[PDB]
């Protein structure tokens, strides 16, 4: 309850390295270099602890003036999906 050994930025990245998929509400982490914020689970090839800092939630990370990560916050994964030509107006 009122206790948790060592809450150091160390084990912050331990829970976040483990990819703890269910740590939504537990905190967020914020990679200043892309100006995005995430849940610990960020499955894409990690950006270092050293560019990354930890909040309570994404409204705090919004307080930092960031945007939700395309993988973590909505879950906005676009892999499979066609990389269709590009040019606009295609009625056929």
Size of the site for Zn ion (CB under 5 A): 5
Q: Please tell me the distance from the alpha carbon of residue 45 to that of residue 60, in angstroms, as a whole number.
A: 24
According to the binding rule CB under 5 A, does residue 42 interact with Zn ion?
yes
Output the smallest distance, CB 11 to Zn ion, in A: 19
Residues 49-78 that bind Zn ion (CB under 5 A): 69, 71-72
Residue 6 annotated among the catalytic residues of the structure: no
According to the binding rule CB under 5 A, does residue 38 interact with Zn ion?
yes
Q: Cα dist. 72→7, 10, 23, 44, 90 in Å?
A: 22, 21, 11, 10, 33
Q: Please tell me the distance from the alpha carbon of residue 41 to that of residue 43, in angstroms, as a whole number.
A: 6
- Known binding-site residue numbers for DNA: 34, 43, 45, 67
Name the strand (E) or helix (H) holding 10. Answer: helix 9-17
Tell me the three state secondary structure of residue 39.
coil
According to the binding rule CB under 5 A, does residue 28 interact with Zn ion?
no
Which residues are tagged catalytic?
Answer: 38
Q: Which stretches of the chain bind Zn ion, using CB under 5 A?
A: 38, 42, 69, 71-72
């Amino acid at each position: 309850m009122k206790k948790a050994t060592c809450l150091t930025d160390d084990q912050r990245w331990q829970s976040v390295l483990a990819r703890d998929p269910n740590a939504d509400g537990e905190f967020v982490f914020a990679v200043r270099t892309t100006g995005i914020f995430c849940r610990p689970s960020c499955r894409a090839r990690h950006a270092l602890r050293e560019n990354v800092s930890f909040y309570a939630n994404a409204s705090e990370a919004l307080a930092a003036g960031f945007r939700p990560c395309k993988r973590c916050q909505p879950d906005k994964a676009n892999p499979r999906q066609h990389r269709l030509d590009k040019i606009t107006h295609a009625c056929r």
